[PDB]
Write a protein that binds this ligand. Structure first.
Ligand SMILES: *[C@@H]1O[C@H](CO)[C@@H](O[C@@H]2O[C@H](CO)[C@@H](O)[C@H](O)[C@H]2NC(C)=O)[C@H](O)[C@H]1NC(C)=O
Ligand SMILES: *[C@@H]1O[C@H](CO)[C@@H](O[C@@H]2O[C@H](CO)[C@@H](O)[C@H](O)[C@H]2NC(C)=O)[C@H](O)[C@H]1NC(C)=O
Ligand SMILES: *[C@@H]1O[C@H](CO)[C@@H](O)[C@H](O)[C@H]1NC(C)=O
Ligand SMILES: *[C@@H]1O[C@H](CO)[C@@H](O)[C@H](O)[C@H]1NC(C)=O
Ligand SMILES: *[C@@H]1O[C@H](CO)[C@@H](O)[C@H](O)[C@H]1NC(C)=O
Lengths: 240, 244, 49, 49, 49, 49
């Protein structure tokens, strides 16, 4: 159910440092054994990010969508499902929704009567009405470290992702991993705020702790290095 | 092009075209005089090339401002209803439409905004019809002291001179970048030749050289490779998706 | 900065004003390179002498 | 405007004012104005141009 | 002063003005009247309503 | 000579041509200044040796 419940007590979110995470391939051109300098939106090096803990203190608040958002979550059993966006976050205006199921993902962009705490247990307990969905597209599920980069430039929503299998209970680890492009979604409207949702087996009732970090992107100049293979192995933040 | 109703300037309809063949031969089936003054490209048989995405926008412009729709131009509607960036590449098509929009009964369905107090950025949509306030005293839904309605109707009538006659227009915008092309002209494919000094054409990438097998570990999202000198070194066939 | 694209996108009397900038820009680079080489060669000859 | 004696219908004082600076904010004080229509120029912005 | 002048006259309506143009190739132009890209001279169209 | 007036007193779309004339002119003048110093520095080094 997604009715007004105040079980979670609001506490100031913690902060953690993102050392060398948030690097993505900026173009389809393929290079090897060169160092290339490019200017694009990027997560600044050693930039601390918000730390959120879900659970029975579920931390699912609304957060502004400030020019691209870095997302990550070190949790098992893929508790997290999808993300929602929009300006007023209700049926009054257009909004974008992305969710996930057992064997695929569902992406729609239409007016939804979003409740206060939409969540997925539940099957369609996230909204109640649909005005007119201009775009829809179903593909394979994205499925313990999982990282995501969201970008909405010129009305083309772009998602870069990478699933790194590690087993630890610590914070973001030191290391490098370039994010590869996944889809390109032409939507054409803007987004100011966004929110996540998770698979909660609401009423006993199955529950577990979930964590996810949020970081904002800024316009910077980077010096990415390509090896003799196709991969990006290191980068330099110019204005650090 | 020949839609029954065209939207107003302040609220123009934007249309997306992708994944098809764009034959540009149908432009000479409409009314005789159809201005085709193009930016960045030459329509004189040189429009047969591949683009990435295409945006189509339509509205109705009076002759007092027919040339306001141009890059780096200012005027009544250029800075308030439809702004074109200076680096815009594309074509603008305009033709007279006095025989359709002008009616004896009266055409008042077309409006244009004058009061905004702020300029327009390239490709901006302004839909608000709230009463503009030019003074400290709030309008509160009444005109008069520095409170004037931004939306002014056009009053198209056939009696009016050609200068005030309504013309139906449409503007086409493309982009030609490294992303795979989705709209292409009417070109016929041909077989692939390897290990031979031949010309080639890959979605407009005209050149000369020898095509051979490539061991490059191309990633599925990667279109073509490059070398140190920043030149096209390897390419992917649009049909058989083979790296050469 | 690609000659083939410019020719394959503009009518002949349009492309001329575009190729000329490219040709002169590239002719300047070659002339600059030779001038530096002549200067360096003279310094080397001094060391060789 | 604040002239007690006004001109006739067919004899209007076609007064030309030059070499001066024109202010339109001061004349807007009266609230008895009924019709204020501008042709070819905006009601605002008149000071600039 | 010119070496010679060659005049060609025929009845062509205004609809064919754009297709029969100096240096602008057309479908009708390729089969009826083709002009060189570097054509020198002028073309005069006269009303015959 | 003032490039500020070119942006404002003259339209944006064509101003890029005039700016190009100024930018190309000044950049070449900068190039000439360097080349003389390279020649002058060679003359001085002969004196220093
Ligand atoms: C997306 O566009 C909408 C316009 O429909 C923006 O909404 C207004 O934006 C202005 C400019 O910041 C604000 O002053 C208003 O308060 C906004 N109104 C509302 C109801 O939100 C919106 O800000 C745009 N989003 C982004 C991220 O730029
Ligand atoms: C570049 O990619 C090639 C893949 O063709 C790598 O070659 C294999 O690499 C793995 C581990 O890197 C080895 O276990 C295989 O035995 C290698 N096979 C062959 C045939 O070379 C190569 O190692 C990659 N280079 C780097 C620096 O990772
Ligand atoms: C994250 O960095 C900011 C930048 O100065 C600083 O406030 C602090 O180190 C971190 N934030 C918090 C709330 O501690
Ligand atoms: C996705 O998973 C849900 C489980 O909630 C299932 O009911 C549905 O049939 C699946 N497929 C689609 C297309 O929704
Ligand atoms: C009018 O619309 C039809 C719709 O298919 C199209 O085939 C035709 O070419 C159009 N005529 C024009 C644009 O002159």
């Amino acid at each position: 159910q997604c009715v007004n419940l105040t079980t979670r007590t609001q506490l100031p979110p913690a902060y953690t440092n993102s050392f060398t995470r948030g690097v993505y391939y900026p173009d389809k051109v393929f290079r090897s054994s060169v160092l290339h300098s490019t200017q694009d939106l990027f997560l600044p090096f050693f930039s601390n990010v918000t730390w959120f803990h879900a659970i029975k203190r579920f931390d699912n608040p609304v957060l502004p969508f400030n020019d691209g958002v870095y997302f990550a979550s070190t949790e098992k059993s893929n508790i997290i499902r999808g993300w929602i966006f929009g300006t007023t976050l209700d049926s009054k205006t257009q909004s974008l929704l992305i969710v996930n199921n057992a064997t695929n993902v569902v992406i729609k962009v239409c007016e939804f009567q979003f409740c206060n705490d939409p969540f997925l247990e539940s099957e369609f307990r996230v909204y109640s009405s649909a005005n007119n969905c201009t775009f829809e597209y179903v593909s394979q599920p994205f499925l313990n470290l999982r990282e995501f980069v969201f970008k909405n430039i010129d009305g083309y929503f772009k998602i870069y992702s990478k699933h790194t299998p590690i087993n630890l209970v610590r914070d973001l680890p030191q290391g490098f991993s370039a994010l590869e492009p996944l889809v390109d979604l032409p939507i054409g409207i803007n987004i100011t705020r966004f929110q996540t949702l998770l698979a909660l087996h609401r009423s006993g009732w199955t529950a577990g702790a979930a964590a996810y970090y949020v970081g904002y992107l800024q316009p910077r100049t980077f010096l990415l290095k390509y090896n003799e293979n196709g991969t990006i192995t290191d980068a330099v933040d110019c204005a650090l | 092009f020949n839609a029954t109703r065209f939207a107003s300037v302040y609220a123009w309809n934007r249309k997306r075209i992708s994944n098809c063949v764009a034959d540009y031969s149908v432009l000479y089936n409409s009314a005789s005089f159809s201005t085709f003054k193009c930016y960045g490209v030459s329509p004189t048989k040189l429009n047969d090339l591949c683009f990435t995405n295409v945006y189509a926008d339509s509205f109705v412009i009076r002759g007092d401002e027919v040339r306001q729709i141009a890059p780096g131009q200012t005027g009544k509607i250029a800075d308030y209803n439809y702004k074109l960036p200076d680096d815009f590449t594309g074509c603008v098509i305009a033709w007279n439409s006095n025989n359709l929009d002008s009616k004896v009964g009266g055409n008042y369905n077309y409006l244009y905004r004058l009061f905004r107090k702020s300029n327009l950025k390239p490709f901006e949509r302004d839909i608000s019809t709230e009463i503009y306030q030019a003074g400290s005293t709030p309008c509160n839904g009444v005109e008069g002291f520095n409170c004037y309605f931004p939306l002014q109707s056009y009053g198209f009538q056939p009696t009016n001179g050609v200068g005030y006659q309504p013309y139906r227009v449409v503007v086409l915008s493309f982009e030609l970048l490294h992303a795979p092309a989705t709209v292409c002209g009417p070109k016929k494919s041909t077989n692939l030749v390897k290990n031979k000094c031949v010309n080639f054409n890959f979605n407009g990438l005209t050149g000369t050289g020898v095509l051979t097998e490539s061991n490059k570990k191309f990633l599925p999202f990667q279109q073509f490779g490059r070398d140190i000198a920043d030149t096209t070194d390897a390419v992917r066939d649009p049909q058989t998706l083979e790296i050469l | 900065s690609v000659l083939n694209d410019i020719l394959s996108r503009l009518d002949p009397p349009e492309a001329e004003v575009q190729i000329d900038r490219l040709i002169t820009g590239r002719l300047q680079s070659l002339q600059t390179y030779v001038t530096q080489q002549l200067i360096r060669a003279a310094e080397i000859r001094a060391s060789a002498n």
